[PDB]
Amino acid sequence: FERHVFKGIEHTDTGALVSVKGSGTQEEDVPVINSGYGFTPAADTELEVFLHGDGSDASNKFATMTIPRNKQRKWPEGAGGVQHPFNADKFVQFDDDSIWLKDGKFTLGNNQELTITVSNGLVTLSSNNEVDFRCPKLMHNGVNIGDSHVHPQKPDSGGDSEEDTDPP
Amino acid sequence: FERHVFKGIEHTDTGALVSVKGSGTQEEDVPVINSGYGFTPAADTELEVFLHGDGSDASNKFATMTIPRNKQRKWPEGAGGVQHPFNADKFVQFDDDSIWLKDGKFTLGNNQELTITVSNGLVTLSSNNEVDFRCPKLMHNGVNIGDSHVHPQKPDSGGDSEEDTDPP
Amino acid sequence: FERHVFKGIEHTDTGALVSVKGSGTQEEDVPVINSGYGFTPAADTELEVFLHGDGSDASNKFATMTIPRNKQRKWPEGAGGVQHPFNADKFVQFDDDSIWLKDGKFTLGNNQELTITVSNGLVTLSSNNEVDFRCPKLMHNGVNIGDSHVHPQKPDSGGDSEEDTDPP
Numbered sequence: 001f002e003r004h005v006f007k008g009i010e011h012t013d014t015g016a017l018v019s020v021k022g023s024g025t026q027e028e029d030v031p032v033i034n035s036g037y038g039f040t041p042a043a044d045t046e047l048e049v050f051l052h053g054d055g056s057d058a059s060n061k062f063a064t065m066t067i068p069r070n071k072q073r074k075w076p077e078g079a080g081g082v083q084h085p086f087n088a089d090k091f092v093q094f095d096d097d098s099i100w101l102k103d104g105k106f107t108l109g110n111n112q113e114l115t116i117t118v119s120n121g122l123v124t125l126s127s128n129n130e131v132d133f134r135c136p137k138l139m140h141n142g143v144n145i146g147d148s149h150v151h152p153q154k155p156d157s158g159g160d161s162e163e164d165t166d167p168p
Numbered sequence: 169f170e171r172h173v174f175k176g177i178e179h180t181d182t183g184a185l186v187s188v189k190g191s192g193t194q195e196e197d198v199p200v201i202n203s204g205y206g207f208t209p210a211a212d213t214e215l216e217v218f219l220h221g222d223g224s225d226a227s228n229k230f231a232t233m234t235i236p237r238n239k240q241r242k243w244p245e246g247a248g249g250v251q252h253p254f255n256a257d258k259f260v261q262f263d264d265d266s267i268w269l270k271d272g273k274f275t276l277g278n279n280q281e282l283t284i285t286v287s288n289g290l291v292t293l294s295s296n297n298e299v300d301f302r303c304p305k306l307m308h309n310g311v312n313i314g315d316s317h318v319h320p321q322k323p324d325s326g327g328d329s330e331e332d333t334d335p336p
Numbered sequence: 337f338e339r340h341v342f343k344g345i346e347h348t349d350t351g352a353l354v355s356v357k358g359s360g361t362q363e364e365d366v367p368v369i370n371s372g373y374g375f376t377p378a379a380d381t382e383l384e385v386f387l388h389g390d391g392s393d394a395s396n397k398f399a400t401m402t403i404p405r406n407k408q409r410k411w412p413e414g415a416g417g418v419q420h421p422f423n424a425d426k427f428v429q430f431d432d433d434s435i436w437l438k439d440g441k442f443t444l445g446n447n448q449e450l451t452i453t454v455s456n457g458l459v460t461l462s463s464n465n466e467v468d469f470r471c472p473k474l475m476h477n478g479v480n481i482g483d484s485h486v487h488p489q490k491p492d493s494g495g496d497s498e499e500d501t502d503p504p
Contacts, residue, residue, distance in 0.1 A: 001169075001388045003337075003398070015237030033218060033234040036205040036416055037372040038241055039248025048397065050369060050388065052169045052218065062171065062218065066369040067248075069351030073374055080375025080403075080421035082428075084247035084262030089446075092260060092267070092428060094420030098448070099439040101429070106444060108274060109286035110257075112266070113272055121465030129289030132475040134281075139300040140458035142503035143315035143336045151319055151333035151487055151501070152284040158328035160494035165319070165333060165487035165501060168479045169337075183405030199404040201386060204373040206409055207416025219371045220337045221387065228337065230386065235416075248372055252430030253416035260418075260428060260435070263389075270391035271435040276427075276442060277454035280434070297457030307468040318488055319501035326496035333487070333501060 006047045006065065011038060018063045021047045031062045039085035107157070174215045174233065175205060186231045188217045199230045206233070207253035342383045342401065345376060354399045367398045375403070375421035396501045 009032075011017070016032035029051070032038065041047060055062040064131030073079070073088040076095070084090035093100040108114040115126040125131065138146030153156045153162030172190030174182070176201075184200035191284030197215040197219070200206065209215060215236045224308070244263070252258035261268040276282040283294040289336040293299065306314030340358030345368075347353070352368035368374065377383060383404045390396040407489070409424040412431070413415070420426035429436040444450040450474040461467065474482030489498030 001390065003390055011242050013238060015240050016242075016434070031234075031237075032240075033216070033232065034237075034240045035203070035232060035254060036207065036418075037248065037250050038243045039206055039372065040243040040245045042477075051170070051179050052220075052388075054169065054171055060402070063458070064369065064371060066367075068368075069245045069347060069370075069373050072351050072368075072370045074347050074352075075374045075376040076464045077376045077378055077423060080373065082204075082250050082260070082373050082418050083321075087262065090262050090265075090267065092418070094333050094418075094423065094426050094439075097426075097439060097441045099426065099437050099441070100443045100448065101267050102446065103262075103265060103444075104446060105265045105267070106249070107266045108271075108284060108291075110270065110272060112268065113289050114284070114291045116444060116450070118449050120465065121449050123444075123450045123461075123463050123465070123467040124470050125291075126470040127289065127291045129291070129471070130473040130475060131291040131293075131469060131471050132478060133299060133301050134292055134294040134477060135297070137298040138481070139298060140306045140314040140336075141302060143299060145306070145313060145315070145317075145336055145481060146476040147481070149481075151336060153321070153333055153489070154331040154386045154495075156324055156328035156330055156492055156494070158326050158425060158494050158496070159328070160324075160328065160492035160496065161321060162330075162492055162498075163490040165201050165489055168476075168481055168485050168487060179410050181406060183408050199402075199405075200408075200501060201384070201400065203371070203404075204375065204403050204410045204421060205416065205418050206411045208411040208413045210413055220388075222337065222339055250372075250418050250428070250430075253487070254414060255430065257358070258430050258433075258435065269435050270435060271430075272491075273435070275434045275436045276439075276452060276459075278438065278440060279366070280436065281454050281457050282452070282459045288468045293459075295457065295459045299459040299461075302460055302462040303465070303466060303467050305466040307466060308482040308504075309470060310468060310476045313474070313481060313483070313485075315504055317504050319504060321489070321501055322499040324492055324496035324498055326494050328493070328496065329494075330498075 002051050003051070004048045004049045004051060006041060006045055006049050018049055018065065020063065022050070026061075029063050030060055032065060033062050037082065039065070043087070169221070170219050171219045172219060174209060174213055174217050175269070176211045186217055186233065188219070194229075197231050198228055200233060201230050202330065205250065211255070337389070338387050340387060342377060342381055342385050343500045344379045354385055354401065356387070356399065365399050366396055368401060369398050373418065375401070377421070
């Protein structure tokens with residue numbers, strides 16, 4: 001085991017290769033053993049890479065990368081989760097209940113077709129196409145605003161009485 | 169340290185056991201040391217398992233599993249996050265801002281009671297029960313559509329004048 | 337390599353320090369090498385810490401923490417993802433499609449300004465400010481409820497005919 005810093009990163013079709021230094025070993029190091037999290041630093045980013053050596057056969061060394069120490073989130077007691085590699089204030093946190101996604105902007109879809117923005121308390125749900133609610137009841141503050149809502153009407157200028165409107 | 173492939177996986181009430189090969193060691197290997205990410209491959213899935221040996225006491229060996237090399241996401245520079253173990257195109261990415269959830273379908277709740285679907289630009293929010301917005305203002309394109317919205321009315325066929333409708 | 341339990345955790349400005357026991361080594365151990373996931377247990381929480389030793393220089397040892405074995409999620413075949421450190425039933429799962437967030441409550445924003453609650457099938461989207469949909473069409477069950485929806489009207493008490501209402 002040996003800690004080395006980080007220079008570059010070559011991405012081949014069998015996985016990621018690092019290029020760690022500490023001793024310019026491997027212009028292309030065997031891996032990054034991905035246990036489901038990954039990231040791409042800019043070249044020469046100040047982070048540590050730990051090499052685990054097969055047998056003691058220097059020959060092959062597998063790498064574990066750490067996110068930069070000064071970018072690590074100080075998780076509260078009882079909580080945990082996943083963060084942005086370079087930003088301790090962007091994360092998905094599991095707490096006592098809040099599956100909490102901390103950012104100002106969230107995108108969903110294969111091409112980011114739904115955008116949720118949260119800025120100065122305004123919540124905006126943006127799409128370039130139709131947004132359709134599929135439920136038996138769609139409400140605002142416990143009032144029906146769905147495909148069955150109606151408006152009461154006042155009497156006209158003649159003094160004739162209106163029914164409620166039909167639905168949308 | 170030693171790399172071994174992956175055969176099966178027995179899940180007991182103290183954690184996960186692998187069944188790595190490379191040398192048919194352990195029909196049930198001590199663990200999978202879960203640093204918060206986990207997954208279940210089908211038996212004989214082509215992936216590596218790294219054993220870390222206690223003392224040098226072969227006796228006990230702890231395992232780290234990698235997601236398959238050809239399924240690892242090529243993270244863009246500055247970004248990172250978590251992925252599906254067998255699909256590089258399904259993930260939660262932290263970028264410059266986009267807490268980006270890449271899929272066509274997202275489910276929320278203990279029994280998936282809210283489904284968000286994103287398909288061909290259509291966004292659908294589906295529930296088998298009530299969906300209720302709890303806010304001071306509910307808007308579409310900056311027009312009120314909440315529990316206080318009203319419609320202007322035109323004059324009737326008599327030529328009498330209508331007020332705006334009452335709220336929903 | 338050596339497994340040790342977990343006592344405390346000191347968080348400095350270069351990263352996390354553990355305080356593992358098994359042999360009261362390090363009232364403050366070099367690290368927690370964060371590969372993007374982190375968590376904070378209460379002191380003396382029953383979990384394992386694995387030390388990886390630099391050179392063989394006991395001097396410096398880097399730590400990997402595991403989530404407690406009895407709190408590890410039993411991931412279904414083909415699936416994986418990230419979990420709450422102390423709750424196997426709170427997670428973000430990647431499955432065949434469901435980017436599935438399992439909890440009763442989800443918060444979005446820098447100060448949790450949007451809350452999505454899922455309880456007894458009721459879905460509630462709560463904000464202390466405006467929620468605004470920015471799309472060409474906002475629908476419920478395929479009926480327009482957006483900034484262009486109108487209501488049909490019935491004849492009045494005079495028997496005069498109404499037009500559809502104007503938009504909101």
